[PDB]
């Protein structure tokens, strides 16, 4: 008999465990939750959380973007809880020393040839338990087909949301609403 | 996986998940896109603006291939032909020729940046910007047809 809001008992919104049945990812988390709990460094606490993320937050960073975040800071190990893709536009790949979950086989060839080390996360623990002189990165989350559609809903004044439309070009959602000559602009 | 669906758990509850007041009636609100003009109008304005009306001049028997034009950018090209790059870095004589048709694009657009290696690009069409960028690289432009 308490005047309490929800008598909370209030839950936490973020994910509380690993969802994968991938056994290697589970053992990765067991490492980095021993290492988070015991070591005290905030690097390991963040890496633990980012390991448990779903696929759309483990988004691929290109080799050419990974150059330019790591530009002034050449010595430091470039961590990315995520995948690493080759940039085809990048002609001469810079050497770096990357850690990540997964390299595509082009990007593994391109770094290793260019004089450039290519680590897993369990190897990063042996070198750098604290995360001393590392660079956390992550690929942009809101940069995909699906996330163009979100926001204020396309027929409202000054939204930049895409409509869900079956096909492109005229004859599809380009008349009443989109022209002033057809009723109204909005 | 019928197992995993809500009906299985939902079984045993009388409403069946649709509610006692309103009920799962056969077709409230019309069928398909019906009612867009009147009752379902609020949904159309927002979500689907520009749906009603006709705009441009119609094209009878429009034929694709007449207009097709796959475009590579200037920032690529090199991906197009890795050995030549180590050849055309050196020498300062001859140049690595990029027939863009052979990989299968017609137009070239200079969205990107290119290394400064003399090169010759042959494409059916060149964007105005692509030409300026290629020339700066010391490259040459050639038209096929």
């Amino acid at each position: 008999g308490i005047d309490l809001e929800r008598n909370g008992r209030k839950k936490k919104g973020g994910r509380r465990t690993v969802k994968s049945q991938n056994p290697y990812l589970r053992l990765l988390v067991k490492l980095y939750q021993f290492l988070a709990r015991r070591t005290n460094s905030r690097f390991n606490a963040v890496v633990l959380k980012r390991l448990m993320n779903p696929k759309r937050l483990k988004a691929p960073m290109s080799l050419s973007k990974l150059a330019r975040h790591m530009k002034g800071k050449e010595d430091h190990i470039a961590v990315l809880v995520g995948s690493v893709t080759d940039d085809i536009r990048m002609v001469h790949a810079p050497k770096l020393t990357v850690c990540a979950l997964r390299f595509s086989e082009t990007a593994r060839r391109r770094l290793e040839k260019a004089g450039g080390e290519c680590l897993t996360f369990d190897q990063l623990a042996l070198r750098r338990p604290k995360g001393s002189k590392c660079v956390l990165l992550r690929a942009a989350t809101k940069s995909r087909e699906a996330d163009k559609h979100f926001g204020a809903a396309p027929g409202t004044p000054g939204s930049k949301a895409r409509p869900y439309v079956r096909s492109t070009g005229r004859k599809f959602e380009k008349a009443r609403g989109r022209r002033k000559s057809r009723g109204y602009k909005n | 996986t019928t197992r995993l669906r809500k009906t299985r758990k939902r079984r045993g509850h009388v409403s069946a998940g649709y509610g006692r007041v309103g009920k799962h009636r056969k077709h409230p609100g019309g069928r398909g896109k019906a009612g867009g003009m009147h009752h379902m109008r609020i949904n159309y304005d927002k979500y689907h603006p520009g749906y009603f009306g006709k705009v441009g001049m119609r094209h009878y028997h429009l034929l694709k291939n007449q207009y097709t034009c796959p475009t590579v950018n200037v920032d690529k090209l090199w991906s197009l032909v890795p050995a030549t790059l180590e050849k055309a870095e050196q020498s300062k004589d001859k140049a690595a020729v990029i027939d863009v048709t052979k990989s299968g694009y017609f137009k070239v657009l200079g969205k990107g940046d290119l290394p400064k290696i003399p090169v010759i690009v042959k494409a059916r069409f060149f964007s105005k910007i692509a030409e300026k960028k290629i020339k700066a690289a010391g490259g040459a432009c050639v038209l096929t047809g």
Binding site: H149, R166 | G32, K33, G35, G36, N43, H48
Partner: peptide
């Protein structure tokens, strides 16, 4: 027709 989906076809 409800919500933000594609108009069905």
């Amino acid at each position: 027709v409800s919500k933000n989906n594609v108009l069905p076809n």
